[model samples]
Target: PPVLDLGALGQDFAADPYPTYARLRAEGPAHRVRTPEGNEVWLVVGYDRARAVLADPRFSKDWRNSTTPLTEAEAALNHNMLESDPPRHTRLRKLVAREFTMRRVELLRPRVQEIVDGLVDAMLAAPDGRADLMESLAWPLPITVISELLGVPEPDRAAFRVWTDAFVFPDDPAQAQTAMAEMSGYLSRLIDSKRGQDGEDLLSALVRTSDEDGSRLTSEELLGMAHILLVAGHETTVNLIANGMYALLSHPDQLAALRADMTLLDGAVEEMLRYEGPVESATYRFPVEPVDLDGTVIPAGDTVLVVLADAHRTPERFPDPHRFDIRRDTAGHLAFGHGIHFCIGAPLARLEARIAVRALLERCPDLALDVSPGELVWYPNPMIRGLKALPIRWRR
Candidate 1:
């Protein structure tokens, strides 16, 4: 198969890759493509093939399972369940899942609502009645929720943001590595601080369990889990709220419809996710053996990328796929991913988005983008799809 070099297509595609993805899907379900990073990999574009590849054990998430070389720090970052295969993945998830129960997430509703209300109140009170929604609401809301949930001190939260931003969209590899080291050092100290402390937070719970012989996560494992949660926990919901608002503002009819009929909010959130999901693609998957996918064989030990952004937009899976209709069923979108690696924080993300969106629309019914759509700066990373900021305004 010929390599479709993504680097050649450039920034416009990075800003909105759906058209390029639609073109690729027209050609085939999977393609050999050179990523912006210069690595050639199999990019699965079809909806069904992506689901299969995500679930199949033949595709391993373990960095140790990969043929790619990794530095010690990079290897250490892989200790999280997101990078592990079964047994280890199972064990890590079981322990985390105990504290991540839906009931536990439900308990956070009052706090989430209070935070959202306070942010909205502040935005409405701004002297100009305008603000960057991402800054004022989307970003802080999730960080606060996750930080409090994990028992991270308020002072340390800003540093976590800095470290996560570098890793998620690193312009320089060395700087990203530096941020990782700094973040790891912070987590180590934070974990130490949690020792024998009585708290209701998840990190405190993990510390208690770590004392037990059979159920304990090693110091390294705890660091890995903390890194992923802090990074993944807020990143997705931040984008979900920001991107979802971007979609509604871009499509006035849908926004008006949603405001007039509050019942559509649930379906609207799903549509927002489907229309412009937070994850452009799932993290890299490596084939353990030569795997034939849709008549194209990905060589053993090669990197595989399931383009969720593309899969959700394929016309075969969604009629008039680019149209953002909140009324659309949106049952099978690949927004949250598929199979065992499905997002564990999904319920929390949904709850946050639902509450945030409802509060914003209900409180400020006239909300709209304060800048031209093209002026919005998008995060350039391929793995994550989101805006850098979303300036919005509403009537006082």
Candidate 2:
């Protein structure tokens, strides 16, 4: 019904995107738009199409497998499960899955809580006794936890931000390309370090993997997978925490509702994800053959992008969807995505958000944004829906 101009949307919708997403969802299951960089692509807006496109074998993630000429940097972006199709996706997924079992992720809960508590304590100890929630709590906690879980060396912790920002925040194609190369190079070294060494971390397990008899991910693949997880895993969670907090501050009733009933925390976390999932769109998929989506003909070989934010807010899927409710069942939300390429880190991301939000509220009932909500600047990158800084104030 409407063709949203991604150019204008990307440059200014960060402050509040629900309005534009609403328009896009009303447009239909799919619509065409030009990206800020002036590239044309179809924006899949309905939940039904979002799930279909994600699971449909006709749409492939591996650009190399497609009848398309991909740039070196674009090819690398599609290197991992985010872009690979079936058998290949299954192979890489199985190997990586072993190291990230639900049991393993569950075991990290206690440790995650401890990390959150320690960070909050540190923030309280500051001279002002209040801190930028990002630096003190939201930002450092997940990165630190992911690093520790991956068995990354202490020295490398300082550089994690550099690679993560470069990969996710592609402000410029050239700059992002450099970030990708630098990240791959760094992970290449890390994989080499873990070759002979063994430990509880995911990387260590990856190095020791074998597929059939003498097959395992090459150093490049290992580094590629690690690069994707390292940045993707924690960065989005950071936004979830920050955005969830922003939601609570803006809605006093919901905040009070959550504090009144601890039981609502889990559902509220899901709602937070649905209300404002960090990832704006799925990585990118191309149709193997022309397909019809709700009467709209998506020609074969066209790049199809799913705007996750739009799907979550479609009124047809969730009545009065724009309204936030902590007590509601947001299980229907496709925040972690859908089908085969669904996020592997969903469990961990949920765990971290629950603990992070719970502790933040439990410790500081009076917590509020330090700056006017409108004055805040959000991440400009089209890939991530996050705040540039969350300067929130609270009491110990």
Candidate 3:
């Protein structure tokens, strides 16, 4: 366990993690971190190591079967696809695979655009010229797209947000457990409601979307998968949208490039995912047995943290990893992770951010931070790095 340097962090780090990530990367890929629960474990920060460990088949995602000891709360929350390895993981992924394909995601692009435009319009109609873009724009844009995609009832979103929030909080273990439980209950009920009925959304699609051989997701698995989608899917997008705008406002040259050349917006979204990903690290991976990797031996039964954020900032992978350049090609970044455990909703997430951020800038050309950069606050959650709020103002 290494001592974390709080001095390196400024309040603005939560709003934008690139600076802190740059500092952490210099320390090395793996370091020991103590969670709110006071559990000490290794944190991997380097891109090469993150990719290697993430894609490596040896590292098991299942805590139930792993040799490592699992904390009750951590084990309970990791039951979904994020924790399943191999045949089970493959099976779980397939349950919703069709719903996440390129075509399916593309079909929702127009719908997402509509949502973004509508939210922006509503926010503009607000009495005050300023609005919390994260709440008004970034938050709802994805919630609408994902909730409608899943056929989730609008009223349930409030409760869903609460549950998902707990699981996303790196600093609060109790709250995280409550969030997981509530989410599990809600998803279970929703899945049951869709039992006989069928619809076009992701949940129904998952239910009706089985192979001829009765390969549909079970009740438990359905609940687990839906819960995963709600938590992991939306949480990461919140950071992506917030971080993307922060990058644009801070870098005038890149912002100008994006404004002048609309084509760069697409690549810029990809760049943001790599440069300031919401999920700083890939979900936890526990090795099945002692294994030697990259000149370091990770003994059996150890919880490994793959720092996707740190990896995306490595100079070796991308020249000038710290620089915020829209022109740079970030196609190879492991922001969505690598190999089997790669994010299932990556295409959808990217599509949402592309539409959300691009539309914001295009429609609100004069958008700028309402508060000074120093006044902004960053959440101290080590796992998912993002702003608590992004205050912005623009000309009417």
Candidate 4:
């Protein structure tokens, strides 16, 4: 299979993938492209095909089904349901859903507000009237909430983030390998420590459920659940808040409009997800049987990435796809995905984003970007779309 190495498309491609995606969609809906990681994948672009691929059961999430083998580190970190199929996926999600209920998420509202408030207080106190919005607000709120929920100790939280950061903003393969070893080892110990005791944290609750009947949840499954949440829980939320704010700050008209009528907050948040969602593509889905998309047959055993960014931007689905309108009808966007593996932390993420974005704007009234939108650097990871830094200034 001929594979298009995405890097050769030019350095600018990572910062704005839309142009290339438009070209890909124009040709057809599927292309066999080689990722930066060097693995060849069948990329499903455009709205209809991407959405169909996302919801279709034929595209299995189990990594073993891939024609290309996963690296040791990738395999170690991907045991969660996002990488599983069928009754196994069903069981894993049910176990997690028991704890991630909307009530629990809604109840987390006050604490979410508290965390954002304290972080904003710190940002406002930066005597220079400017700060990296990504550092002060976007990063802290979600991490703090995730840490507390997972029962990660204060001392371990910092290191845990570093381990996960390797994957979120992966700079080198060596780093991911090193980070994975530490993360897996760390979770291994954390799981053991939580086994003997009782705690109100999610990890502890899962432990209790597992111990109920050993057959219910295996030790490996337990670790996978914790690992996936630890990374997915905060990392994606960080992007949502950061990317959403950048979208607002960069587009002055939208910013002014949102400020004038704060009711647009909900629409603004949804637009952020639809415009440039956190996870650029959903988790890899392997085709166990030949799959025909727009007459492009994805042979069995090939890996496929349903490009969420491209699907959201296609003119067929969203008119004037390039414009970031806060009032756009963003219903059914694949930002949180479409099927069984839809983001589990989506509600908590929305809560955190709405609270954080509003708090930053309300408290810092005259906020403006310190850097031009073109200057904003995005993460290198194709799977996630987020800013490296969101520099902004406001009245002290």
lDDT of 2 by residue, 267-300 (tens): 9988889887888888778888887887788887
TM-score, cand. 1: 0.96
Question: Per-candidate TM vs. native?
Answer: 0.96, 0.92, 0.89, 0.97
The candidate with the higher TM-score, 3 or 4, is 4
In order, the Cα lDDT scores of the candidates are 0.85, 0.76, 0.74, 0.85
Q: List, residue by residue over 1-396, the lDDT tens digit for candidate 1.
A: 468888788787779888877787777777888877677777888787777788889998987678888777676667888998888899898878855667878888999899889988888888777899988999999999888888898988998778778887678878888888788888878977898878768888877777664355877788788778878867788999999999999899999999999999999999999999998899889888888886778887788889899888877788888899999979988888888889888888988999999998888857899999899878767788889899998885
Cα error of candidate 4 at position 101, Å: 2.7
Q: Write the per-residue lDDT of candidate 4 for residues 144-198, one digit (tens) a residue.
A: 9888888888788888668767866568878978898788889989988998687
> What are the per-model numbers of colliding residue pairs?
0, 3, 4, 0
Candidate 3's C-alpha runs over 4 A off are 1-29, 65-79, 170-172, 208-216
Worst 10 residues of 3 by lDDT: 209-218
Candidate 1 weakest ten by summed lDDT: 207-216
Off by over 4 Å in 2: 1-4, 65-69, 73-78, 210-214
Error of 1 at 171 (Å): 3.3
Candidate 4: where is the Cα deviation over 4 Å?
A: none
The pairs that clash in candidate 2 are 1-27, 61-83, 62-83
Cα RMSDs, all models: 1.5, 2.4, 2.9, 1.4
